[PDB]
Structure formats: structure tokens, C-alpha cells
Amino acid sequence: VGIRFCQECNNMLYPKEDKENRILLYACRNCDYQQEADNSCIYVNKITHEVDELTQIIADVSQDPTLPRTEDHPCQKCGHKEAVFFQSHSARAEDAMRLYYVCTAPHCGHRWTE
Amino acid sequence: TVINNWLLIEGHTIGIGDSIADSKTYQDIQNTIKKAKQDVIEVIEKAHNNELEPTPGNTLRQTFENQVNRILNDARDKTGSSAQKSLSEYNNFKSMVVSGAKGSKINISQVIAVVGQQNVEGKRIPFGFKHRTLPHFIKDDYGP
Amino acid sequence: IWGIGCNP
Amino acid sequence: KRHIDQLKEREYNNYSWQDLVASGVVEYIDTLEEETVMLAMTPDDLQEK
Ligand SMILES: [Zn+2]
Ligand SMILES: [Zn+2]
């Protein structure tokens, strides 16, 4: 999944298999350093790309004057009543009109979707 | 020639008296708009809860726009029909529409009851600003 | 200026 | 009301639009900043609760 950069040359490590030991080794083409791979996964592609946008949402968006705010939905973490609510705001979000609520009030930074 | 010389005796005119309708008709138009706005709000709340089910061959955004446009169009036509009921025999807008000389039922409806939905490029007014049509409206407002 | 099915 | 009173006697008070801008009552907003601004069409109607 993640890309690992070699210490010796600070370049990308590409997967390589040692036939003798049948052990996956991440080896740079430029330098001879080789590292055994713990993950054992080379390439992962999510065609559905069903990735939650809760992680992507920034807590700073609560400060926006233009965003609508509801006191109807209380915060789960701290119980603050106000909560700005906005849609996906994302391209390639397929067809979702879910409201990604963000708790207001300083430093709570809680994002929940109902 | 003959009809134009009779028109000197009878005469024709267009005034504000033609545009104005009875108070009951205005109340009916307003009530239709009220319940239409409520229906659009209910559709929006269904969409936010994700209870809305996609129409076959259409995305959820497309089917939400379809349903909202249907509700707004039905309200628009119903208010127009109420306005057209209000018209008296003497009303001159009706004289011209019935005779076919100029105008249409749509023009009477827009004059008296409701101008209607404004559509650009086949859709409702788009989000020119970031996620809102005009700076005065709140972000992510799909209301009427 | 009327609706989506009418005219602008 | 004090600002409009000074503006009403614009003559012999040398109070003008520049004074209004300097006082912070009004501000110039371009479109890019308009995207980040919540505006009210009419003050009394929209500001009031
Ligand atoms: Zn290296
Ligand atoms: Zn909170």
C-alpha cells in the first residue's frame, strides 16, 4: 500500500522477489539496498472507492459563516448543540446527499454523519 | 374593414384591472406555493437521510432534481389554473388569448399567479458561487 | 422562465 | 444613526464616503471574497430575528 523510500539513496523502493529464499524484497533500482516487506501487498485498487469522507473533513470548516448550522443535532462527543452541516462537497462522490455534520465550539473538532 | 369599423364602437384595451385577480384567488395561489415549498422541503429531508431511492437509469442527484422539478412544476401549473379561473368574461387578457390574436395561457399565468421556475441549460439555476447560487443564500441550499 | 419543459 | 446624521449634513461637516470607509462601516468586496461572505439583501428584514 504505502510507498517506502530507501535510506541510502532516498529513492522509491520497487518490489522484487528473491527466487532463492522466496522472500519479497523492496529494492531500489538505483542503489543495492534491499528490504523485506512486512505488508506483503504490492498493489491495491478499490474500484468501488467507498472511502469515508469523515476523515477528509477538516474541523476548521466550522468557522465558516456561509455554512448552515443546526442546533437540532447535538454533538456526540461533547454535547454542544450547534453543528454546521454540509454535503459531500466532493467530485466522484457518486450520488450521495448525506450531511457530514461538524460540531462547532472551540477544539471539539468532531465529525459525524447521520 | 368592417370589423375594424365596428371596433370603433366597441373598442379594446389592456389595463392593470386585467392583471389583478380576486382576493380569494390570491390566497389560493399563496396556499399552493406554501404546500409546494413544504413538499420540496420534505423531499430534501428524505434525500439528506438517504431514504430516497434512485430512479432506474438516473443518479440520486438526477432523481432528486426530477422530483423537485415535478413538485415545483405541478405547483406552478396549479397556480396558473387558479389565476385563469379568476378571469372574468370582460377580462381583456382573456379576450386576446381566447381569440388567439396574441398571448397564451402561460402569459396570463405568469402575469397573475406565478412567474415560474427559471431554468438555465436545462437545469435549475446553477451554483455559480461555491456551492450556492448567490452570496445571500446559505451553502448547499437546494430549496425552491 | 417558466419551467423545465417549457421555455427558460 | 450617528453616521447618517453626519452624512445628512454632508455640507459644512466634511463627512463623506471616504469617512464611512475609514470608520469601518462599509467595505469593498470583490467576487472572490464574495464567495466567503454571507450577505443580506435588506438589512432590517434579514438581520432581525
Ligand atoms: Zn537506496
Ligand atoms: Zn462537540
Automatic annotation (TrEMBL), chain B:
DNA-dependent RNA polymerase catalyzes the transcription of DNA into RNA using the four ribonucleoside triphosphates as substrates. RNA-dependent RNA polymerase that catalyzes the extension of a non-coding RNA (ncRNA) at the 3'-end using the four ribonucleoside triphosphates as substrates. An internal ncRNA sequence near the 3'-end serves as a template in a single-round Pol II-mediated RNA polymerization reaction. May decrease the stability of ncRNAs that repress Pol II-mediated gene transcription. It is found in: Chromosome; Cytoplasm; Nucleus. It comes from the Eukaryota. This is DNA-directed RNA polymerase subunit. The chain holds residues 674 to 817 of 1970 of the full protein. Belongs to the RNA polymerase beta' chain family.
From TrEMBL, chain D:
Residues 17-49 form the RNA polymerase Rpb2 domain. Belongs to the RNA polymerase beta chain family. RNA-dependent RNA polymerase that catalyzes the extension of a non-coding RNA (ncRNA) at the 3'-end using the four ribonucleoside triphosphates as substrates. An internal ncRNA sequence near the 3'-end serves as a template in a single-round Pol II-mediated RNA polymerization reaction. May decrease the stability of ncRNAs that repress Pol II-mediated gene transcription. It is found in: Nucleus. Signal peptide: none annotated. This is DNA-directed RNA polymerase subunit beta.
